[PDB]
Amino acid sequence: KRNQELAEQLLKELPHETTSIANLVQRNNRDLDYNLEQLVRTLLQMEKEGTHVTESLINTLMETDTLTPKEQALIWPAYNLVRQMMHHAALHH
Amino acid sequence: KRNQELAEQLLKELPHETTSIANLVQRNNRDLDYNLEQLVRTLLQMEKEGTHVTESLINTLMETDTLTPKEQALIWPAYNLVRQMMHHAALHH
Amino acid sequence: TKRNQELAEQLLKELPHETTSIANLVQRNNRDLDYNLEQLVRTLLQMEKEGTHVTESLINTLMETDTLTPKEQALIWPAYNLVRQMMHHAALH
Amino acid sequence: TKRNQELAEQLLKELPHETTSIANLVQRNNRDLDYNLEQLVRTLLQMEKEGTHVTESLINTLMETDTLTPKEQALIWPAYNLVRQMMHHAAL
Amino acid sequence: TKRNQELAEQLLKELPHETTSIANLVQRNNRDLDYNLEQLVRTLLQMEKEGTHVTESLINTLMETDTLTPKEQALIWPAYNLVRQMMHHAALH
Amino acid sequence: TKRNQELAEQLLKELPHETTSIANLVQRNNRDLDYNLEQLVRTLLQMEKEGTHVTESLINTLMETDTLTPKEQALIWPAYNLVRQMMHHAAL
């Protein structure tokens, strides 16, 4: 009933093509980068409030089921980056 | 050890602020819009290949555990939109 | 006269940018889904506020015995997932 | 827990502004009318460009035949009026 | 002379846009995580290709008895999740 | 299942281009050197603007005191050379 040609025509008119594997990786990188920046901000909010961010704090946050699986996947990279940022801010010039 | 002031300063230097509730909704809308467009494309790929997209096809795709939970959440809105698009493409002028 | 044709040709260049018909059908469908999702999210948070904890089993019971409309049932899981994210986000911060 | 209730109460204040259901039905209908009007205006100007002069009689003939969809027939006169305004506005 | 100062002031306006130090630390950390994640994803797909099906229990066993490096263990779950998405995406399409 | 293996084999061909580990260590080190060089160049020009003329003797004094980090000391001469080129290039 011309249904196949209609579909073929709609597919050309659709804004974005079907996502490549390369585009799935890029999209997943952006999502990890977004979630990592929120975790970094959460950990620095704790540091600002007077809860010092240490390996032991991260271990206790992990033991306590506080964090989503996506957060638990990124909590160590967030920890590493927070430490780098705290050390960078410490040095003069 | 000036750790709180360091954290307070880093938080001002961070590109994006902590995400509002409004921004969580906007971000969730963009993710639903992205996943809906991919589902619409998958269903139209089926229509192009000669698998007619009907309420019964969607029921069978749902019975068979083929789709992720996020896909199952959007398969009916994708179905509705595919039907609208197929009907819009059918009419002359 | 060909004056009329040139006037029309000039007006066609000056017309505001127009989304294609299919692209506008998608955008319009996204806005409608986003609006209906935000109402459901509000309804579920109203339940939580009043002391009815929003859980997978509450959603199952509301769906059994037809307490939700078919339009609600279409979006109830995305609404549920977003409410859970929001309750977790509020618990931090 | 009382914590869950207060969290929900706080989230309800933080939720983006929501148009009431009736107000949103109007707004949505305005957007759709504006979109369909601008398509019809473009279609009528495409005809003018191709050498079909856009007149009251052309609109009557398009209506008397089922050449237009119901949605188009609803907006064809406002599209006609606007096309005439635009043709008059052009090259004053 | 104040010639030297004005020359410097002019050069400072002409210098390419510079990301702030903290923003560059984030960007650099994202690139490193993205690179290491893509290597792990490749390693896991190589296993799948060779006939070792990539499952939650395989990841658990590789993590127990220290078969993965600490740097691998840091990203193994995000790699796992992405491999699962990619295998599901390839099954459609 | 043989299906899983072929899917993986196909995904491996579709994966974005990956620099080898050694090549990526070089590229990453180049980006970091380029970034830290441009910061030092900016710092030296900020000094020139403020009235501290940038000379070989100033760089020697900055080095002889532990005023610079190890990363800065590694790049201070290339930053100096580039600042001198830029000051000479400006107002030829």
Author numbering:
A (entry chain C), B (entry chain C): 60 to 152
C (entry chain B), E (entry chain B): 59 to 151
D (entry chain A), F (entry chain A): 59 to 150
From the paper:
The protein C is a small viral protein encoded in an overlapping frame of the P gene in the subfamily Orthoparamyxovirinae. This protein, expressed by alternative translation initiation, is a virulence factor that regulates viral transcription, replication, and production of defective interfering RNA, interferes with the host-cell innate immunity systems and supports the assembly of viral particles and budding. A previous sequence analysis revealed an architecture common to all Orthoparamyxoviridae C proteins, with a predicted N-terminal disordered moiety and a C-terminal helical moiety. We solved the crystal structure of the C-terminal part of TupV C protein at a resolution of 2.4 Å and found that it is structurally similar to Sendai virus C protein, suggesting that despite undetectable sequence conservation, these proteins are homologous.
